[PDB]
C-alpha cells in the first residue's frame, strides 16, 4: 500500500544514494567528460 | 420464404415504417419501395420513401432535358448507327457559341447550338435541387445547413459559366459538353492562364479538397472503431456524454495534440467543405477579371 | 478588383478559424482537471466558451453542455505517482473496481427515445415483427470465451428498426440473471461462436440488465465497455495466451 | 495536463515486450515507446529542410531543394544535395510515419478502441510509398522521384506533368478522381448530418434518427442509416490513393509514353475497325 | 500551488529552453558578419 | 475557470512574448536603413 | 493515498523538499550562470 | 524525490544525448566547405 | 468532490493568490522595462 | 537491472550501431566527388 | 389497373408528349433546310 | 386525390407559364426575320 | 402463380415493346439519304 | 387536396416575381442603343 | 401550413434587399455613365 | 423563436460593419481616383 509522507517512493535512505549516485554523477561522468574532450575539439576546426 | 440470422453481424429488417410528420407531406410519397435484401445485414435496406413533389421533380425534368440536349449532340456524327454511338460515347463534342459570338443567341442548331438548352434547364435542375436540400429540412424541424455547403458548392458554378461570361461577354468561356470535351478544358485554364500553381486561389481550393480526405479518413475510421461501444449513435453522444466521446475524446488528444466535441466533429467537417468551392468560386472569379497569367502573378505577389 | 487586396479578408477572417472552431471542439470535456477533483494546470489557448441553451429530444430537461464534469461516480485508482504525469494502478483486480481499460458513467433513468412513443433496443421477443419459419434457421447455438472454453448459449436477437441492425446477442445462461456484450468484436465463422476478449469463467461480472427488455443510458456504459477492460490486461505472461491474444490478422 | 474525466483512463501499459520504460505521458501528448521514437524523428527532420539551404541554394522552404538521385547511378546512392543527402530524409519522414501510426497501439491496447486507426494512416503509408520506393528502382535509379518542397514539387507535376500526354485519359487516375470528388461529397452532408437539431432554427425540441429518416429519404432516395455514411467517410479518403498508386504502378515504368495514346485501344473492334464515324470519323 | 515537476523537470522542461536556445545558435552562424568561427579560411 | 495560471508561464508565456518578438524582428533587420547587425565595418 | 479537491496535488512537503529542490536547478545553471556565458559574448563580438 | 532511479535514469541519458548531440553532428556536416572530410572537396 | 457554484474559484477570498503572484507583478515590471528598457533605446539608433 | 541487457543492448543496439551505419552510407558514399569504384568508365 | 388511373392522366399529360415532342420540334427545325417562318426577312 | 386540387393550378400552374413560355421566348427574341424589336435604323 | 397474369403483361409489357422500339427507331430514320420526312422536300 | 395553404402565400407572393423577373429585366439592358437609362444623356 | 415563416423574415429577408443589391452595386458602381464617387473630374 | 438574439443580434451585428465594411474600404482606397488620403504634394 501506498504511504504518506516525503516523499514515496523513494525510499530513505535513497536522496543520497539513488539521487546523487545515479544523478549528480551525470554532472560529472559527462560535464567534465566534456571539457578534457573539448581540448580536441575546441580547436578543430573553427580556426582555418 | 424466411429472411434467415447468420453468423455475426447482426441484421434485422424493417417492416411498414417511414420516419417523421410535420410540415411533410401524406398523398404524395408513392408506395413502399421494395427492399433489397441481399446480404443487407452490413448497412441498411430500405428502398423509399421519397419527396416526389414539385421541389424535386423540377430536377428529374431540367436535368433530363439537360440529359437529352448534349444526348442530340452525341449521335449527330456517329453516321446514324448504334456501332458508333457506345464506340465514341465520349469522343464525340460539343462547344457553346463561339469565342467572338457571345452575348446574342441568335445562333442556329449546328455550330455551336445545342448548348443553349441543356443548361437552361439544368438551371432550374441544380437551382431547383439546392431546394431539395435546403427546405427537406423544414418539413420536420432540423436546419439549413445542408445546402449551405450547396450554396458554397454553387459557388463555383456561380462563375464558370455565368458571371464572368456575361461581364467579359462570350460562350466558350463557358464549359464545353461530354465526357472528356471539358478534360481538354481543365488544362485549357491552366497553360492559357500562365499555370495556376502561383494562383493560391485556385491552389487553397485544391488545399481544402487535401482537406476532405484529412478529416474522412479517420471519421470514417475511429466512429466505426468506438462503435462497439456505442458511438455509431450519432445521435446520442453530445449533450449527453456517452463513452464513445472517450474512446474517442482522449485518442487523438494523445495522438495529434488536440480532440473535440461529439458536436464539434461536424463543425470543422462543414469548415473543410463551405471553403472548398467558395474559395474556388473566389480563386476563379480572381482569374479572368484580376490576372490572367498567374506566373505573372505569383513572381510580383510571391517573391517580388 | 486588383491583384493584391482579397488575400488578407483572409489571412484576418480565417486566420482565427482553427482559434474559433477549436473551441466549439472544446466544449465536452473541458474545463481540464487534475489527477483527483481539481482546478487543473488550464485549458489551452483556445479555452472552453460558455455554453448556450441545449433542448433535448424528449423533454429530457435543461442539461447544458458542457454539462455535468465533477466526481459523482466511483473511481478506485491508487495513485502511485502523487506527481501529476505517471500512471496509476487499481486497488484489487481491476476488473472488479472499475479503473483503466473498464469505463462507465452514471446518468438519468430515462432510456433513449426515439419518437414512437417507445425504447429504443429490444430483443425479438418483444418485436413480434421478423421470425422463422421456412428451412431450418439458426437462432441458437452455443459459444465461446477468450479462454478457449465454452461461454454460454445465444438464442436471441435485439433487433433494430430505424437503422435495421442489432447492438446485442442474449445469453442464457443455466440459470437465468441477465448478461450483456458488445456487437463489432465479434468473429463467428462456421457452428460455433468465438470471442477473444473476456474468458469464458468471467461472464458474470458483466452487470445483469436491470431489464432484459430495456436498455437504459445509465446501464449502456459498462455493458459496453467490460469487454475493453479485458483489451489492455489480458493476459500475462506465459504460454497458452500468447499463441492467442498476440499474432492473428483480423 | 489532462481532462476532467481522464481520471480512470491512466494506467501503464500498453507497450509490448519489455516493461513500460517509455509510456511518460508529456503534457497533452502522448509519449510511449513510439513516443520518443518521433521526438527522434521530428527534431532530426527539420535540418533536413536546412541542410541544402547551403547546398543548393535558398534558406527558405520556398525552394529549398534536396533532389532526388538520378536516373541510371544505378542500384546504389549518390551525389548528395542531389541524392545522397536525399537519400537520408526518407526514412526519416517514413520512419515517422511508422513510429506515429504504431504509437496508437500503444493507446489502443491500452484502452479497447479498435485498431482500425493503424490503417488509415496506411493507406497514407501506401500513398506516400508509391513515389519514393514503388518507382526508381527498377527503372534504372533513385532518379525518378519528386522533390521533398512545397513550390519546388509543383513546377514539377505540371509543366512537368504532360510528358504521357495527358493524364485525364489515365482511367484509373480518373476513377481514383471518381474516387475524391466523393470525399466531400458526403462529408458535405454528414458533417452536417450532425449540427441542426439542438440547433434547429432556435429553440425547437432536438431531432432523432427518424427525423434523419424524413429529411435523407426526403433527400437523394437512399438512407444507409447513420452508419452507413461512416462507412461512407471511409469510404471517400482511403482509395482514391490505390487507384492512384494503380495509375502509377503501370504508368511510367511500363508507360512513360502518351497516355492521351491509349484511348486509341478502345476504337480498335473487330465491328467497328475501318470504320471512322464520328468526330474520329 | 497545483503545477508538476517530477515528471515534467526530467524529460519536458529541457526541450523548452532547448526551444529557445539551440534554435538560435544556427542564425548566429547564416549571417556573414557574426559568425564567430565560420569565417575562417579567408 | 475560465484563465487559471500555474502553467501558463513555464512552456507557453515564454514563447509567447518571443512569439510577439519574432515576427517584428525580420523587418526592422531588414529594413532600408536600419538593420542594426551586420553593418559595423564601413 | 488518493487526493480530492484543490489544489492538491500538491503538496507538501511533497512540494517543500521536492519542487522547491529541482525548479531551481533549472532557474540558476540557466539565469545567472547563463550570464557567466555572457562573458565570452558581450565583449565577442557586437563591437568590430 | 519521486521520479525515476531503476527505470528512467539511465535511459533519459542514453538516447536524449542521442537525440542532442549525434544529431547536432548533422548541422556541422551541413557544411560542405568545413566538415572534416569535405575540405577537399572546395 | 470537486467544487460548487459559480465560480469557485472565485472566489472572495480566493481571487487574490494565485491570479496575483505570477500575473501581477510579472506584468508590472515587464512593463517598467517596456519604459526602462525602451526609454535607453529612444535615442539610437534613430539619429545618425 | 538499471539498464536492460537483453531488452535495450541485444536487438535494440544491433540496430544501434544500425543507427548510424547506413544513413552515412548515403553521405560518405555519395559525396559529389569521391565515389572511387562508381567511376570505372569515365 | 396497373397504372393509375386518376392520377397519370392528369399530371402525366405533361410529362409523356413532353419528354417527346420537345425532341421532335428540334429536327423538323434543323435550321437551312425549312425556313417557312424566317423567310420573312429574306 | 392525388391529383394536386388547390396546389398544382396554384402553384405548378404559376410556373408552366414560365416552363411552357420562356424556353421558346429566348429564340424568337433574336430571330432577324421577325424582329419587331430589332430593326433598328435599317 | 409462375407466370404474371396482372402485372407483367399490363405495365412491364409496355417497357418490353418500349425497349425493343424507341432504341430501334434512333436508327433508320434521319439517314442523311433515306430519311422518308427530311428529303421529303429537297 | 394534398397541400395546406397559408404560408407559402408570403414566398409566392415576396419573392416568386423576381424569380421570373431577375431572368427577363436583363435581356433587353445589353443593347447599347435601347438602355434608356443610358441613352437619355449625350 | 406547409413551409416556414418565422426563419424568412429575420435571415431569408436579406435575399431580397442585400444579395439583390450588393451584387447589382458593384454594376452601376462599375459603370461610367454614373460614376457618382467617380465623377470627380473627367 | 424565428433565430436566435441573445447570440446573433448583437455578436453577428459585428460583421455588418467589419467584413461589409472592409471590403468595400478596400476598394475605395486602391482605385487610381480616390485615394485621398494620399494628396500632399501640392
Ligand atoms: C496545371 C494543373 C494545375 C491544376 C489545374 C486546374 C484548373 C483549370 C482548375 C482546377 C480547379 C481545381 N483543382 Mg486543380 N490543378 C492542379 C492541381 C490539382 C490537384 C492535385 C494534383 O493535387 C487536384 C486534386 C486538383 C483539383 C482541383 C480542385 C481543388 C479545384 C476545382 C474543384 C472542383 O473540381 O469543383 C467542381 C465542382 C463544382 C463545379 C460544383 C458541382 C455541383 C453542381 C453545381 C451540381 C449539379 C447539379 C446536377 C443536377 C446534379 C445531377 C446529379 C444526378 C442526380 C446524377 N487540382 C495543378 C496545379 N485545377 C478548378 C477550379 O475551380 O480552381 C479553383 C479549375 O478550373
Ligand atoms: C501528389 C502530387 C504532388 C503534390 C500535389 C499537391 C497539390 C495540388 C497541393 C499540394 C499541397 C501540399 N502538399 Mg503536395 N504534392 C506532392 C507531394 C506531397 C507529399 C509527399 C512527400 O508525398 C506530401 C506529404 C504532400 C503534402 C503537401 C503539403 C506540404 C502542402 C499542403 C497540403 C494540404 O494543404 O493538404 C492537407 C495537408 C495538411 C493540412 C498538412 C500540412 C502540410 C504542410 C504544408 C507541410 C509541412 C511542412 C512544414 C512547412 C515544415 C515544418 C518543419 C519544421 C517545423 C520547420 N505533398 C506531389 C509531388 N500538393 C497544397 C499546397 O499548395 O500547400 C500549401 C496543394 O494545393
Ligand atoms: C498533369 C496534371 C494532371 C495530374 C498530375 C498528377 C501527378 C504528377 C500525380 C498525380 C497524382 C494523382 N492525381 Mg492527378 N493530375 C491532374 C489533376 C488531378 C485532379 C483534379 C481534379 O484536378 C485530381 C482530383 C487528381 C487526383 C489524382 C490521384 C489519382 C493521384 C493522387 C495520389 C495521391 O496523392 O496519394 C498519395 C498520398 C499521400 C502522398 C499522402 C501520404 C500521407 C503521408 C504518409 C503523411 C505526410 C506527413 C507530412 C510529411 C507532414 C505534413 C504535416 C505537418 C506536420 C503540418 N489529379 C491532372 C489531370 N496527378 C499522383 C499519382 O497518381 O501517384 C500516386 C501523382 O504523382
Ligand atoms: C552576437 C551575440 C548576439 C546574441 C545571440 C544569441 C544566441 C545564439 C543565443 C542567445 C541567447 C540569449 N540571448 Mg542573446 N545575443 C545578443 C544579445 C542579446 C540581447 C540584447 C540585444 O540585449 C537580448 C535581450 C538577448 C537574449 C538572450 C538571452 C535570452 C539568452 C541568454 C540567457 C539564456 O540562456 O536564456 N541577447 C547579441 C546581439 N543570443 C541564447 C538563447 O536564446 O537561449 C535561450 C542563444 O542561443
Ligand atoms: C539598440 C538596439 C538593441 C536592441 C533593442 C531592444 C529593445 C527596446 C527590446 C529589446 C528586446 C529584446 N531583444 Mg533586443 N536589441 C537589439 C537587437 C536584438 C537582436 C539582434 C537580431 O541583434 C536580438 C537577437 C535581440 C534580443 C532581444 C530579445 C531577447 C528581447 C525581446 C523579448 C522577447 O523575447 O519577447 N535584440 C539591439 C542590440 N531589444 C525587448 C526586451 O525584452 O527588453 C530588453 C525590448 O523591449
Ligand atoms: C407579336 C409577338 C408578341 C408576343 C406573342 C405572344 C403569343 C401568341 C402569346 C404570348 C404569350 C405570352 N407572352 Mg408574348 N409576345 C411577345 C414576346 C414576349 C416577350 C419578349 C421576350 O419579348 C415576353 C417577356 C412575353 C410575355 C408573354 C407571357 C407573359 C405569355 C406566355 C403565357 C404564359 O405565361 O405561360 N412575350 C411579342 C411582344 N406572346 C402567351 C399568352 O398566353 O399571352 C398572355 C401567348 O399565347
Ligand atoms: C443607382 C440607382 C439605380 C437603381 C439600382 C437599385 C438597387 C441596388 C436597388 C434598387 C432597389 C429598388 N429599385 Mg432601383 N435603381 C434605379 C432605378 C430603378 C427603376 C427604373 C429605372 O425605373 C426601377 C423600376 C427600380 C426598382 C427599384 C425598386 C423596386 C426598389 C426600391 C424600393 C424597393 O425596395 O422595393 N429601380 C437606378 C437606375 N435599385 C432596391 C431593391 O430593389 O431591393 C430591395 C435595391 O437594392
Ligand atoms: C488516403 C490516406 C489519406 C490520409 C489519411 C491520414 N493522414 C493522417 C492520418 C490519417 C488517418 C492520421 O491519423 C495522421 C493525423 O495526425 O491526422 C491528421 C495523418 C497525417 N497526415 C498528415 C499530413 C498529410 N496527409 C496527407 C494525405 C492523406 N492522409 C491521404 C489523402 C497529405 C497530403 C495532402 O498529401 C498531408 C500533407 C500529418 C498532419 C499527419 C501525420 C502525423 C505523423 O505521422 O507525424 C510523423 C512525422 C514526424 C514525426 C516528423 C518527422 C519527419 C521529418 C522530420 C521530416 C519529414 C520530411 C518530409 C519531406 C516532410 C515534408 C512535408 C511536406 C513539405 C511535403
Ligand atoms: C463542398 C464541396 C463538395 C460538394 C458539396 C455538395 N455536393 C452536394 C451537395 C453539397 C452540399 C448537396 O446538397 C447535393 C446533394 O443532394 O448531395 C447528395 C450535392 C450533390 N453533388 C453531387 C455531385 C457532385 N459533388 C461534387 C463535389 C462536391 N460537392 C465537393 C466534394 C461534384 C463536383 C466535384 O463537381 C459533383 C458533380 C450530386 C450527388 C448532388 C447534386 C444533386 C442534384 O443537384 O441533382 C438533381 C437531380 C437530378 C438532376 C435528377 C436528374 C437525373 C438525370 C440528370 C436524368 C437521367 C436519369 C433519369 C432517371 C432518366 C431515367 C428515366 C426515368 C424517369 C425512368
Ligand atoms: C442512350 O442515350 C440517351 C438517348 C439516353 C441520351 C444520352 C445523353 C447523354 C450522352 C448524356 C450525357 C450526360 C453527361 C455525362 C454530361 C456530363 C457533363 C459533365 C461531365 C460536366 C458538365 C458540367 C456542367 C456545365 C459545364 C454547365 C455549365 C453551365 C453553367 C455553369 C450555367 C449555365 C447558364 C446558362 C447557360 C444561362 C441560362 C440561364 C438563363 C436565365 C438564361
Ligand atoms: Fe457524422
Redesign the pocket.
Known amino acids: 500500500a501506498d504511504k504518506s509522507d516525503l516523499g514515496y517512493t523513494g525510499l530513505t535512505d535513497e536522496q543520497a544514494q539513488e539521487l546523487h549516485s545515479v544523478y549528480m554523477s551525470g554532472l560529472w561522468l559527462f560535464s567534465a567528460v566534456a571539457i578534457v574532450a573539448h581540448l580536441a575539439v575546441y580547436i578543430w576546426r573553427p580556426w582555418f | 420464404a424466411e429472411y434467415q440470422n447468420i453468423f455475426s453481424q447482426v441484421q434485422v429488417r424493417g417492416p411498414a415504417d417511414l420516419g417523421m410528420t410535420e410540415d411533410v407531406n401524406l398523398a404524395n410519397r408513392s408506395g413502399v419501395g421494395p427492399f433489397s435484401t441481399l446480404l443487407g445485414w452490413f448497412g441498411n435496406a430500405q428502398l423509399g420513401p421519397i419527396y416526389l413533389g414539385s421541389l424535386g421533380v423540377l ?1 428529374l425534368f ?2 433530363l432535358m ?1 440529359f437529352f440536349t448534349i444526348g442530340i449532340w452525341f449521335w449527330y456524327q456517329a453516321g446514324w448507327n448504334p456501332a458508333v454511338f457506345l464506340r465514341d460515347l465520349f469522343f464525340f463534342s460539343l462547344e457553346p457559341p463561339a469565342p467572338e459570338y457571345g452575348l446574342s443567341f441568335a445562333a442556329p442548331l449546328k455550330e455551336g447550338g445545342l448548348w443553349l438548352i441543356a443548361s437552361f434547364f ?1 438551371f432550374v ?2 437551382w431547383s ?1 439546392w431546394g431539395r436540400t435546403y427546405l427537406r429540412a423544414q418539413a420536420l424541424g432540423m436546419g439549413k445547413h445542408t445546402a449551405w455547403a450547396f450554396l458554397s ?2 459557388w ?2 456561380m462563375v ?1 459559366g455565368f458571371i464572368r461570361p456575361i461581364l467579359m461577354g462570350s460562350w466558350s468561356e463557358a464549359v464545353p459538353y461530354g465526357i472528356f470535351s471539358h478534360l481538354d478544358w ?6 492559357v492562364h500562365g ?3 502561383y494562383n493560391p ?3 487553397l ?2 488545399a ?3 482537406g476532405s480526405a484529412l478529416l474522412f479518413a479517420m471519421h470514417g475510421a475511429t466512429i466505426l472503431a468506438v462503435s462497439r461501444f456505442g458511438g455509431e449513435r450519432e445521435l446520442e453522444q453530445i449533450a449527453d456524454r456517452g463513452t464513445a466521446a472517450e474512446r474517442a475524446a482522449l485518442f487523438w488528444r494523445w495522438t495529434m495534440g488536440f480532440n473535440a466535441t461529439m458536436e464539434g466533429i461536424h463543425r470543422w467537417a462543414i469548415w473543410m467543405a463551405v471553403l ?2 467558395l ?3 473566389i ?2 472569379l480572381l ?1 479572368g477579371t484580376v490576372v490572367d497569367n498567374w506566373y505573372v502573378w505569383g513572381q510580383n505577389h510571391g517573391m517580388a | 478588383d486588383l491583384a493584391s487586396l482579397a488575400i488578407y479578408s483572409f489571412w484576418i477572417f480565417l486566420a482565427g478559424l482553427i482559434y474559433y472552431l477549436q473551441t466549439e471542439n472544446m466544449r465536452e470535456g473541458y474545463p481540464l482537471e487534475n489527477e483527483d477533483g481539481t482546478p487543473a494546470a488550464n485549458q489551452g489557448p483556445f479555452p472552453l466558451p460558455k455554453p448556450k441553451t441545449f433542448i433535448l429530444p424528449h423533454g429530457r430537461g435543461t442539461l447544458t453542455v458542457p454539462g455535468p464534469e465533477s466526481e459523482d461516480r466511483p473511481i478506485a485508482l491508487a495513485r502511485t505517482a502523487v506527481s501529476e504525469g505517471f500512471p496509476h494502478a487499481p486497488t484489487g483486480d481491476p476488473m472488479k473496481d472499475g479503473v483503466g481499460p473498464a469505463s462507465w458513467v452514471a446518468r438519468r433513468d430515462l432510456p433513449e427515445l426515439d419518437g414512437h412513443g417507445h425504447n429504443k433496443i429490444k430483443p425479438m421477443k418483444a418485436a413480434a415483427g421478423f421470425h422463422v419459419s421456412a428451412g431450418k434457421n439458426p437462432i441458437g447455438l452455443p459459444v465461446r470465451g477468450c479462454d478457449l472454453e465454452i461461454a454460454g448459449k445465444v438464442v436471441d436477437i435485439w433487433v433494430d428498426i430505424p437503422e435495421q441492425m442489432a447492438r446485442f446477442l442474449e445469453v442464457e445462461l443455466k440459470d437465468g440473471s441477465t448478461r450483456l456484450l458488445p456487437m463489432q468484436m465479434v468473429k463467428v465463422q462456421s457452428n460455433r461462436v468465438h470471442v477473444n476478449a473476456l474468458s469464458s469463467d468471467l461472464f458474470a461480472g458483466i452487470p445483469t440488465i436491470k431489464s432484459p427488455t430495456e436498455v437504459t443510458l445509465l446501464e449502456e456504459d459498462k455493458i459496453c465497455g467490460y469487454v475493453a477492460g479485458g483489451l489492455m490486461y489480458a493476459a500475462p505472461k506465459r504460454k497458452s495466451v500468447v499463441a492467442a491474444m498476440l499474432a492473428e490478422y483480423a | 495536463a489532462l481532462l476532467s474525466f481522464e481520471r480512470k483512463y491512466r494506467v501503464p501499459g500498453g507497450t509490448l515486450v519489455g516493461g513500460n520504460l517509455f509510456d511518460f505521458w508529456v503534457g497533452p501528448f502522448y509519449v510511449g515507446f513510439f513516443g520518443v521514437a518521433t521526438f527522434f524523428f521530428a527534431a532530426l527532420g527539420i535540418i533536413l529542410i536546412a541542410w541544402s539551404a547551403v547546398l543548393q541554394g535558398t534558406w527558405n522552404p520556398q525552394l529549398i531543394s534536396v533532389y532526388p538521385p538520378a536516373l541510371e547511378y544505378g542500384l546504389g546512392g549518390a551525389p548528395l544535395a542531389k541524392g545522397g543527402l536525399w537519400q537520408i530524409i526518407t526514412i526519416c519522414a517514413t520512419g515517422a510515419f511508422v513510429s506515429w501510426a504504431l504509437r496508437e497501439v500503444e493507446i489502443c491496447r491500452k484502452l479497447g478502441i479498435g485498431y482500425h486507426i493503424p490503417f488509415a494512416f496506411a493507406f497514407a503509408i501506401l500513398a506516400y510509398l508509391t513515389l519514393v520506393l514503388f518507382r526508381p528502382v527498377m527503372m534504372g535509379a533513385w532518379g525518378y522521384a519528386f522533390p521533398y518542397g512545397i513550390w519546388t514539387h ?1 513546377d514539377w ?2 509543366n512537368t ?1 504532360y510528358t504521357y500526354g495527358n493524364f485525364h485519359y489515365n482511367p484509373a487516375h480518373m476513377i481514383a ?1 471518381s474516387f ?2 466523393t470525399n466531400a461529397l458526403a462529408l458535405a452532408l454528414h458533417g452536417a448530418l450532425v449540427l441542426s437539431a439542438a440547433n434547429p432554427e432556435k429553440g425547437k425540441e432536438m431531432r432523432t434518427p427518424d427525423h434523419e429518416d424524413t429529411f435523407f429519404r426526403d433527400l ?1 432516395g437512399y438512407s444507409i442509416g447513420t452508419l452507413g455514411i461512416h462507412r461512407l467517410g471511409l469510404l471517400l479518403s482511403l482509395s482514391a490513393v490505390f487507384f492512384s498508386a494503380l495509375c502509377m504502378i503501370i504508368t511510367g515504368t511500363i508507360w512513360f509514353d502518351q497516355w492521351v495514346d491509349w484511348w486509341q485501344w478502345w476504337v480498335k473492334l473487330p465491328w467497328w475497325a475501318n470504320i471512322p464515324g464520328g468526330i474520329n470519323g | 500551488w497545483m503545477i508538476f515537476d517530477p515528471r515534467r523537470v526530467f524529460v519536458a522542461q529541457g526541450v523548452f529552453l532547448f526551444l529557445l536556445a539551440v534554435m538560435i545558435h544556427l542564425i548566429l552562424l547564416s549571417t556573414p558578419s557574426y559568425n564567430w568561427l565560420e569565417i575562417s579560411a579567408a
Open positions: 430536377s431540367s436535368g439537360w439544368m435542375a441544380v435541387w458548392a454553387i463555383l458554378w464558370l481543365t488544362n485549357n485554364f491552366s497553360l499555370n495556376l500553381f486561389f485556385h491552389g481550393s485544391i481544402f479538397l487535401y472548398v468551392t474559395t474556388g468560386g480563386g476563379i482569374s | 509543383l507535376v505540371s506533368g478522381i475524391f470528388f437523394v
